[PDB]
Scaffold this active site. Structure first.
Site, PDB file in Angstrom:
ATOM      1  N   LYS A 199     -15.970  -0.491  -1.027  1.00 58.57           N
ATOM      2  CA  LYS A 199     -14.877   0.300  -1.406  1.00 58.57           C
ATOM      3  C   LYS A 199     -14.511   1.537  -0.342  1.00 58.57           C
ATOM      4  CE  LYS A 199     -14.317  -0.930  -5.665  1.00 58.57           C
ATOM      5  NZ  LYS A 199     -14.594  -0.788  -7.122  1.00 58.57           N
ATOM      6  N   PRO A 250      -7.105  -0.928  -4.286  1.00 59.01           N
ATOM      7  CA  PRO A 250      -7.819  -1.669  -3.417  1.00 59.01           C
ATOM      8  C   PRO A 250      -9.532  -2.156  -4.008  1.00 59.01           C
ATOM      9  N   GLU A 251      -9.896  -3.251  -4.043  1.00 57.95           N
ATOM     10  CA  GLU A 251     -11.248  -3.514  -4.083  1.00 57.95           C
ATOM     11  C   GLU A 251     -11.844  -4.000  -2.667  1.00 57.95           C
ATOM     12  OE1 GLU A 251     -12.402  -5.927  -7.522  1.00 57.95           O
ATOM     13  OE2 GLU A 251     -10.682  -5.169  -8.551  1.00 57.95           O
TER      14      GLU A 251
END
Length: 270
Positions: A53, A1-2
Site C-alpha cells: 500500500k 487505494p489498496e
DNA sequence: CGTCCACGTCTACTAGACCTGGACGG
C-alpha cells in the site's frame, strides 16, 4: 487505494512521465501537514514503483541540471483517497496537495498527488515503512514466508478478516480485497486466522497475491474509478462480494465492514 | 437542512481522531 491501485498509480506515473521533463520546485499546497519537499532542479525525470500500500517516487536530475541535486526519493501512502493525476498546469484538480511541474519544451503539465480527505502521507527518505511486510503482488514468496514463519504472533489470534488488514503481514490488502479473498474460498470471515493459516504450515496465501493481481490486469484505476467511467464498470463487474446484493456484512472490531456470504464464523461479534 | 458511509492508518489512552463529499432521508 489498496495495493492494486498503488501499483496502477505507479505504473501510470511511469507511463505518463516517460517523455516528460520536469523542472523547478516541488510545490505543496497550503494547509499541507505533510512536509515540504526540499528539491529544486532545472530538468528532472520522475519514476515510480509500488510496494504494498505504498508508492515510491524517484526524482532524477538530468545530466547537467542545476542546482546540483542527488536523485531524491519520496514515499507516499494514499489513505482513503490518494491518487495521482497528470493535469494542465492551470487546470489543477483540487485538492492537489503536492505538485511537480513540467519544464517548457511543450504544453505545461502538473503531476499532482490528489487527496480529498487528506489521510495520505509522505515522508522524506525513500524508505518503505518499517514494519510493513512484503508486497503481496511483487514479493509473493517473501510475503508467504513472512506469514508462515510467524503464526505464533498474536496478530494471528484475531479473526482472519482482521488479520488480513494487518499490514505487517498483508501489505497491500484492504477492505475490498479481504472480502473478495475470503469469498473465493468460502472461509468464514470470523474463523480464527491461525487456524486457517496453520493448515498450510489455490490456498489463502496464494489468493492474497492473485486476487489483487486480477485487479491490476483489469488496468484502469481500480477502486478509484469514477462512475460512468469505463474502468469503473470493469471494477464493479469484477467484484463478487464486497457490497454486493445477497451478501451479509458485519462490523469487525475496528468498525470496518466485512462483506461475506454464509457462515460468519466462530469469532463473530454477537 | 440533516445522518451515514467510504479503497486507512495514526496516536493518544480500544476508542477516537483525522477529512471531504456523495447518497439519500425528512
Amino acid at each position: 487505494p489498496e495495493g492494486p491501485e498503488l501499483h496502477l498509480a505507479s505504473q501510470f506515473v511511469n507511463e505518463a512521465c516517460r517523455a516528460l521533463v520536469f523542472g523547478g520546485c516541488v510545490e505543496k499546497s497550503s494547509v499541507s501537514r505533510n512536509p515540504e519537499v526540499p528539491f529544486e532542479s532545472s530538468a528532472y525525470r520522475i519514476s515510480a514503483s509500488a510496494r504494498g500500500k505504498e508508492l515510491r517516487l524517484i526524482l532524477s536530475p538530468l545530466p547537467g541540471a542545476q542546482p546540483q541535486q542527488e536523485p531524491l526519493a519520496l514515499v507516499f501512502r494514499f489513505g482513503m483517497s490518494g491518487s495521482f493525476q497528470l493535469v494542465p498546469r492551470e487546470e489543477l484538480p483540487r485538492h492537489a496537495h503536492l505538485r511537480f511541474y513540467t519544464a517548457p519544451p511543450g504544453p505545461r503539465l502538473a503531476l499532482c498527488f490528489v487527496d480529498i480527505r487528506r489521510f495520505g502521507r509522505w515522508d522524506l527518505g525513500g524508505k518503505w515503512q518499517p514494519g510493513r511486510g512484503p508486497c503481496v503482488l511483487q514479493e509473493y514468496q517473501q510475503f508467504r514466508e513472512n506469514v508462515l514463519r510467524n503464526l505464533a504472533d498474536k496478530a494471528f489470534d484475531r479473526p482472519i478478516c482482521e488479520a488480513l488488514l494487518d499490514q505487517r503481514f498483508f501489505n497491500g490488502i484492504g477492505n475490498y480485497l479481504r472480502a473478495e479473498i475470503l469469498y473465493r474460498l468460502k472461509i468464514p470471515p470470523f474463523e480464527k486466522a491461525r487456524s486457517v493459516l496453520e493448515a498450510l504450515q489455490p490456498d489463502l496465501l496464494e489468493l492474497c497475491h492473485s486476487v489483487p493481481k486480477e485487479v491490476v490486469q483489469l488496468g484502469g484505476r481500480g477502486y478509484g474509478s469514477e462512475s460512468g467511467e469505463e474502468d469503473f464498470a470493469a471494477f464493479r463487474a469484477w467484484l463478487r462480494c464486497y457490497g454486493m446484493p445477497g451478501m451479509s456484512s458485519l462490523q469487525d472490531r475496528h468498525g470496518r465492514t466485512i462483506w461475506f456470504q454464509g457462515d460468519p464464523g466462530p469469532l463473530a461479534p454477537k
